[PDB]
Ligand binder design. Structure first.
Ligand SMILES: Nc1ncnc2c1ncn2[C@@H]1O[C@H](COP(=O)(O)OP(=O)(O)OP(=O)(O)O)[C@@H](O)[C@H]1O
Ligand SMILES: [Mg+2]
Ligand SMILES: [Zn+2]
Lengths: 286, 189, 41, 59, 95, 290, 204, 209, 51, 94
């Protein structure tokens, strides 16, 4: 598509959290909506700033909602005066999931940026996923004969920081972040987190299938198509060729691990030699 | 008075009719030009904005202490779709809830020139909801008043309650120009 | 490797004496006070 | 505006106080701008020339 | 005179300006670090303005750097020596 | 009613990130902006947010505050739940430490004329490194009071003398024309968790296996490197056998250390191969056809 | 800051009865409330030598995001170990050389509180190098602690009394020394000859 | 806290940094460095500086105020003289040059052959010549043979003229000489050509000028 | 480890201390004076440290 | 119909099911391979077709329930291995 990856800077996250908190101080709200400013680098979005805009909606009806687009334009001008290279690239809202009226809001935003990106930023501290979920509006051409509609195609979202922004984040995360853990422990923790995320995704798919089976949701006929491919992609690890290749590869890596460990042991013995010699010299001169 | 207003102009199909000279669309354009000017000279701090009442409501311009932009927006307003009075009033109320200065007073100008295709219960509940937030909605009952004179009657009666002329139901029978009936109406008084 | 690492013994040296000495550190404070009192004026 | 002009001239006089550094105009660029070499053997670029019309300067 | 006030205010705005040291780009180290040599002076590891192109800063490019931070403020065309300018702009005599 | 040295300026995480980003973007201009917050009491100055003022033009210095832009930004921010007054101004010092120049003093005099307890914050985006941002807060010392023989502020606690002033700031008029207010940071659990997502790798790449062709090529290359490294390591051991203690480090200058490179290669290969093996073993269980 | 000391005083000498409060205060996100938890550990275990409270104080001292909380955690060890003054110059001795100046100040103050009036030679030997610490308030705390430890002490009882007596005068009469070091030295002079040489400090 | 201190000590490397030349390592943590300002200083070395990169004649980045050795620049960096790019290669061929077979053979055997056949030279026992001095009457194909070598070489070519080294800034001449040699060493195989060597290689020197 | 940390933190302050000039000794003199030649800056008559 | 472990269709099976001669079976597979309906390869020496992918089709509710049961087993395996990794590497886990 027109968007390959959306990089959301920590300043955007902090601004969104602050906007949500200051609006929610009123004690009666569900979500807040603002505008996202960034630059364009190849096909990778670089969402780097944001500003709040007045917004309200009805709890029952989805067609009733007000967004101050004049406020949008005025603050776009004010921000453009400060930073001309940051242009409107989309919008954000803090609702935990999508809304039925999100397509209308994206249509409103598309005038200012034709390829607008909606970045749902969950203020609640989710334990596994990233707080950002990026979507772009696409015209879904169905093959069932149903008329073409506008949907939100998901986009891989990442959190990246500028050099000074990273410096500030590390200053704010100085105490909390533990960097003493070695690289190997970090990779193993990454594997654990990947297992947890895969379990969560599979549980979401299972819950959707459970709802479909009991009739809570209709058969999409497109999620089923994707799920058949997913189950077909499950490799057979019991094949003789695969097992032999896996064993050969594991032995090829284990011989390297053995060589590295042997060299490490010899170097450790050399260190012990140096320590003992230094201790004996220190006690001999004293 | 220090109040903020938002005009609920109608751009339905029935605005193409030549009942009001020269056309109902041009007639409501002149009426909007008059009412926004009146609200501007009533108080220099007053806020005016334009909300359309097409098939789907679209806030053309939010509240602003400016007049020419309102007519600039109205110039491009083409007659399309069917009136949706239920959602338009709530969209306008949402807009007034986010005015620049909260010390301003509620006010909505409604230009109904097409039949309201809703049950009376929805209208009375909307009127009660607006009355709770002290919202005053002034409705011009031109166009199809022969069918809307009852629903709007209940709307205005429930909005104003029993005391105070917070909102009016100025009904302009077809003639030379409904704007010529506006300057004698309590809307601009 | 673990056995060899666990066999390394550090003699009980007077630690934190290789740091800045009090007299020499005071030297810097006085010279820098003169620096601030003379350059800015 | 006369008082503002006089105060502006007074500020110029404060900034125009002696001594000056004697330099030689090396170059005149457009992006109106000057390049000078001071007698301290230093080359500087001036985005704005200053209190002298750029037309009255030559390398 | 309105134009007199405009010129006086122009002089006032010009007075706040500060000259920039002219050096030459030697080598771009990183995306935000450069090695530049002053025209008659030492070589420095400096930064560059974000708004600068950073693609016109080829090695050997003359640049103007901030006086304090030495950050590359601008890139300039190849300098013409005043002696060379006088050589070119010398009247022969219409012979 | 002398100011207390125990006064503190509380900068929120959003504010700090905004000033750091604006200062780094505006390098080397002394780009300025306004700090919205609240004077909680005589000892606290909370900085809830900041907004940057646009630069009028070229010049590495603080420009005059544009009243129209400030008024417009304040009025519009009040419309979206930010009704916080201006508690002072911030501006960037790209690399020459945190202090106030004469222009900065004149600019801060305006805020002090408006609000007597306004704070001039200086942030050094160039000298700031990860985990330690170079920042300071200042307020002018009135010449009339200090000249007559009065301390600029009263010391009722140790809180105002915990940070030793830098010599660069002292040279530039610190404790003479302006004083430094201790800066503390307000961090909540929510914002810290939100910032923790920075560089947080996706769950997909946790189970993602590296290309086995490139992995084998890397293993072979590093092992071939350790071959030469051990060949040199033997010579290094023999040389250090006969080498005086003054040359233990001087002779190591400019010459590669086979032991250090051997350790680095061992660590790299151990990590890479162990991670690849563990990931493959996990994938053989998770993604199975049965 | 006032309520931090107040809550601790409310539960003075309560042994384990303050535990439910302590775990509430020590787990609080407010650094001042964590400092209050440290002070409550000190007050609820005054001189009991309860190694559970000592363990908690040491854990907070070595691992806490706030320097004030760490300093108070090290400070609170004196109120727990004053009944056995010989133990403090051992548990705290290593803390007295830590990187954190606040932890060093807390170590000095713990020596002062626990070994107050005792004239402990080990604690004074620990405090003597701390009077030359690069950080000013560490020096001030070390001087005040040295005053508390050997208040009223004579030359025969404590051989280092004259040395610190001259040290206080030198620090006070040093124009180039920091103002807070001189504050600590003056407080030390006041403590060392408090009550007209007829008073002491003894929490027991 | 050790990791935090390691991270926070890097603010000493914040730009702008002056450029010096690592002259000598006095001990583990101090060294004599020659700054480009023209003065030699005995400064300290940042503990996180890779001492394996502190080779002789290595460009280093020094703190602008304290002159302390805070970084080591890449050897190919900090060079006022650049190598010949593809577009700068002269169009002169060996075939374009007529009738210098003896000179062509000597240059090839002394320049282009040792670059590609150094192992053969070692095996035979020949010591390859470090440098070549091409001399003769003016206009006898010297500079053109250098052009042909540059056009027909797979190695780096660094063309320079002797009069370029003489500069107003005292110390910049030797600095750029060692920069040329460092750049050639870092891009080995390389050929350094110095046309009109008499500009810096005369036999008479006046000590008072 | 604590000594390593402390030395690392003090190194940042130490590295900001100005570097020392390198000079050549012409001759020693009375009262612990030495005639040196700073590399670019001519000659000086300098004191001698007590160490 | 066949499970992924037994997607090796003999030439006789295709010939009998499609009511075509054996010698034509290969050509039929060619079409199915060319259009993109199925993916795989043909081992003519052993007269077998190694099918590895199928065009996804509309599934009944019972088939969706069976798919959900497969997901149940998959989730059980993923959770078991995640707990195993967490338990074994608890000390080094960050
Ligand atoms: N053998 C040759 N064949 C063809 N042309 C030659 C030959 N030798 C010299 N030339 C001519 O010499 C001209 C340039 O002279 P060149 O620069 O090679 O001389 P040189 O020895 O470097 O002189 P100088 O000592 O004055 O620097 C070229 O135009 C080229 O045609
Ligand atoms: Mg020639
Ligand atoms: Zn400034």
């Amino acid at each position: 598509l027109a968007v390959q990856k959306v990089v959301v800077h920590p300043l955007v996250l902090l601004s969104v959290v602050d906007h949500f908190n200051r609006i929610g101080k009123v004690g009666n709200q569900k979500r807040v909506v603002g505008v996202l400013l960034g630059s364009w680098q190849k096909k990778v979005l670089d969402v780097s700033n944001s500003f709040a805009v007045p917004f309200d909606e009805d709890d029952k009806d989805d067609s009733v909602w007000f967004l101050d687009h004049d406020y949008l334009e005025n603050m776009y001008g004010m921000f453009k005066k400060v930073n001309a290279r940051e242009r409107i690239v989309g919008w954000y809202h803090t609702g935990p999931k999508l809304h039925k009226n999100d397509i209308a809001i994206n249509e409103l935003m598309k005038r200012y940026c034709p390829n607008s990106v909606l970045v749902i930023i969950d203020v609640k501290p989710k334990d596994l996923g990233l707080p950002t979920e990026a979507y772009i509006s696409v015209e879904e051409v169905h093959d069932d004969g149903t008329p073409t509609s506008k949907t939100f195609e998901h986009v891989t979202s990442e959190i990246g920081a500028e050099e000074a922004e990273e410096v500030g984040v590390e200053h704010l995360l100085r105490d909390i972040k533990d960097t003493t853990v070695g690289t190997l422990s970090q990779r193993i923790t990454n594997q654990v987190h990947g297992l947890k995320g895969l379990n969560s995704k599979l549980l979401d798919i299972r819950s959707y299938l459970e709802k479909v089976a009991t009739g809570k949701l209709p058969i999409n006929h497109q999620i089923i198509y994707q799920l058949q491919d997913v189950f077909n992609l499950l490799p057979d690890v019991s094949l003789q060729e695969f097992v032999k290749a896996f064993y050969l590869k594991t032995n090829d890596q284990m011989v390297v691990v053995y060589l590295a460990s042997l060299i490490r042991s010899v170097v450790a013995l050399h260190n012990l030699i140096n320590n003992k010699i230094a201790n004996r010299d220190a006690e001999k001169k004293e | 008075v220090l109040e903020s207003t938002m005009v609920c102009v109608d751009n339905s199909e029935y605005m193409r009719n030549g009942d009001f000279l020269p056309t109902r669309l041009q007639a409501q354009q002149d009426a909007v030009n008059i009412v926004c000017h009146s609200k501007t000279r009533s108080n220099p701090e007053n806020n005016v904005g334009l909300i359309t009442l097409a098939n789907d409501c679209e806030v053309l311009t939010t509240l602003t202490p400016d007049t020419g932009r309102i007519l600039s927006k109205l110039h491009t307003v083409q007659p399309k779709g069917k009136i949706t009075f239920c959602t338009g009033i709530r969209v306008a109320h949402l807009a007034l809830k986010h005015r620049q200065g909260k010390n301003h007073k509620m006010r909505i100008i409604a230009f109904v020139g097409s039949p309201v295709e809703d049950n009376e219960k929805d209208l009375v509940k909307l009127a009660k909801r607006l009355k709770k937030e002290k919202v005053n909605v002034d409705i011009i009952n031109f166009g199809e008043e022969e069918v809307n004179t009852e629903k709007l009657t209940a709307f205005v009666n429930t909005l104003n309650g029993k005391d105070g002329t917070g909102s009016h139901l100025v009904t302009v029978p077809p003639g030379p120009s409904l704007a010529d009936a506006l300057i004698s109406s309590p809307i601009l008084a | 490797h673990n056995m060899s690492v666990k066999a390394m013994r550090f003699p009980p040296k007077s630690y934190n004496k290789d740091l800045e000495s009090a007299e020499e550190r005071r030297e810097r404070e006085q010279q820098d006070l003169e620096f601030a009192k003379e350059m800015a004026e | 505006m006369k008082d503002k002009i006089k105060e502006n001239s007074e500020k110029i006089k404060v900034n125009k106080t002696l001594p000056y550094l004697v330099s030689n105009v090396i170059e005149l660029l457009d992006v109106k701008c000057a390049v000078i070499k001071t007698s301290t053997r230093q080359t500087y670029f001036l985005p704005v020339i200053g209190l002298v019309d750029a037309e009255k300067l030559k390398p | 005179l309105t134009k007199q006030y405009e010129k006086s205010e122009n002089d006032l705005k010009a007075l706040q300006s500060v000259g920039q040291i002219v050096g030459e780009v030697l080598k771009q180290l990183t995306e935000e670090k450069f090695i530049v040599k002053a025209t008659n002076g030492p070589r420095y590891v400096v930064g560059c303005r974000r708004q600068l192109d950073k693609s016109k800063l080829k090695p050997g490019t003359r640049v103007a750097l901030d006086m304090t931070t030495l950050t590359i403020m601008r890139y300039l065309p190849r300098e013409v020596d005043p002696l060379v300018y006088n050589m070119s702009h010398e009247d022969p005599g219409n012979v | 009613p002398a100011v207390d040295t125990a006064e503190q300026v509380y900068i929120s995480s959003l504010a700090l990130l905004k000033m750091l980003k604006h200062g780094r973007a505006g390098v080397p201009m002394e780009v300025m902006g306004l700090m919205l917050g609240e004077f909680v009491d005589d000892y606290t100055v909370r900085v809830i947010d900041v907004f940057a003022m646009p630069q009028s033009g070229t010049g590495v210095s603080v420009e005059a505050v544009d009243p129209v832009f400030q008024a417009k930004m304040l009025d519009m921010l009040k419309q979206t739940g930010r009704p916080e007054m201006v508690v002072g101004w911030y501006h960037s010092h790209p690399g020459f430490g945190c202090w106030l120049s004469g222009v900065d003093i004149n600019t801060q005099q305006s805020f002090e004329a408006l609000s007597e307890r306004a704070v001039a914050v200086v942030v050094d985006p160039i000298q700031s490194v990860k985990g330690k941002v170079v920042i300071d807060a200042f307020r002018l010392i009135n010449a009339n009071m200090m000249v007559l023989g009065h301390e600029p502020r009263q010391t009722t606690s140790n809180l105002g003398h915990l940070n030793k002033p830098s010599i660069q700031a002292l040279i530039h008029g610190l404790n003479r024309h302006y004083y430094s207010i201790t800066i503390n940071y307000r961090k909540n659990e929510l914002e810290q968790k939100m910032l923790l997502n920075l560089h947080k790798k996706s769950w997909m790449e946790g189970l993602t296996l590296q290309d086995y062709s490139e992995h084998c090529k890397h293993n072979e290359s590093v092992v071939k490197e350790m071959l030469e490294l051990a060949k040199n390591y033997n010579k290094a051991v023999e040389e250090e056998d006969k080498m005086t203690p003054e040359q233990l480090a001087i002779k190591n200058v400019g010459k590669q250390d086979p032991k250090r490179h051997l350790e680095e290669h061992v660590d790299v290969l151990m990590t890479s191969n162990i991670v690849q093996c563990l990931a493959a073993m996990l994938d053989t269980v998770v993604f199975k056809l049965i | 800051r006032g309520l931090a000391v107040g809550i601790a005083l409310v539960m003075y000498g309560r042994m384990e009865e303050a535990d439910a409060l302590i775990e509430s205060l020590c787990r609080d996100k407010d650094p001042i409330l964590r400092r209050s938890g440290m002070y409550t550990v000190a007050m609820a275990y005054c001189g009991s030598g309860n190694n559970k409270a000592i363990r908690r104080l040491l854990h907070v001292a070595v691992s806490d995001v706030n320097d004030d909380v760490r300093r108070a955690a090290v400070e609170s060890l004196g109120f727990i170990l004053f009944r056995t003054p010989e133990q403090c110059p051992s548990v705290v001795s290593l803390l007295s050389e830590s990187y954190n100046p606040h932890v060093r100040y807390g170590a000095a103050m713990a020596l002062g509180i626990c070994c107050a009036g005792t004239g402990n030679k080990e604690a004074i030997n620990l405090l003597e190098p701390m009077t030359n610490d690069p950080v000013n308030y560490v020096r001030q705390g070390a001087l005040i602690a040295s005053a508390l430890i050997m208040i009223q002490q004579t030359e025969i009882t404590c051989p280092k009394v004259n040395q610190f007596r001259q040290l206080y005068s030198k620090v006070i009469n040093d124009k180039h020394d920091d103002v807070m070091a001189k504050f600590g030295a003056i407080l030390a002079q006041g403590i060392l000859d408090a009550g007209g040489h007829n008073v002491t400090i003894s929490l027991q | 806290e050790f990791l935090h201190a390691q991270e926070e000590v890097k603010r000493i490397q914040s730009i702008p940094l002056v450029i010096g030349q690592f002259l000598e390592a006095v001990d583990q943590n101090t060294a004599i460095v020659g700054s480009t300002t023209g003065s030699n200083y005995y400064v300290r070395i940042l503990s996180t500086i890779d001492r394996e990169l502190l080779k002789p004649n290595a460009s280093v980045a020094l703190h602008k105020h304290s002159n302390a050795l805070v970084d080591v620049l890449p050897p190919e960096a900090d060079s006022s003289i650049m190598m010949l790019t593809s577009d700068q290669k002269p169009d002169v061929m060996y075939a374009d040059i007529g009738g210098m077979d003896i000179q062509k053979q000597e240059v090839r055997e002394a320049v282009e052959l040792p670059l590609t056949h150094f192992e053969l030279y070692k095996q035979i026992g020949i010591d390859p010549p470090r440098g070549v001095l091409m001399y003769g009457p003016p206009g006898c194909g010297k500079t053109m043979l250098a052009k042909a070598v540059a056009h027909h070489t797979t190695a780096a070519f660094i063309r320079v003229v002797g009069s370029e080294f003489v500069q107003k800034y005292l110390g910049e001449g030797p600095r750029m000489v060692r920069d040329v040699f460092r750049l050639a060493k870092e891009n080995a195989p390389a050929i350094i050509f110095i046309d009109e060597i008499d500009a810096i290689a005369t036999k008479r020197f006046d000590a008072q000028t | 480890l604590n000594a390593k940390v402390r030395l690392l933190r003090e190194e940042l302050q130490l590295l900001q201390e100005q570097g020392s000039y390198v000079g050549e000794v012409v001759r020693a003199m009375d009262k612990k004076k030495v005639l040196v030649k700073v590399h670019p800056e001519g000659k000086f008559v300098v004191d001698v440290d007590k160490n | 119909t066949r499970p992924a472990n037994h997607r090796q269709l003999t030439f006789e099976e295709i010939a009998k099911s499609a009511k075509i001669t054996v010698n034509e079976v290969e050509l039929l597979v060619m079409k199915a391979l060319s259009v993109g309906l199925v993916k795989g390869s043909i081992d003519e020496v052993d007269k077998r077709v190694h099918m590895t992918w199928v065009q996804p089709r509309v599934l009944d509710l019972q088939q969706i329930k069976g798919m959900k049961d497969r997901l149940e087993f998959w989730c059980t395996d993923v959770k078991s291995m995640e707990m195993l990794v967490e338990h074994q590497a608890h000390d080094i886990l960050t």
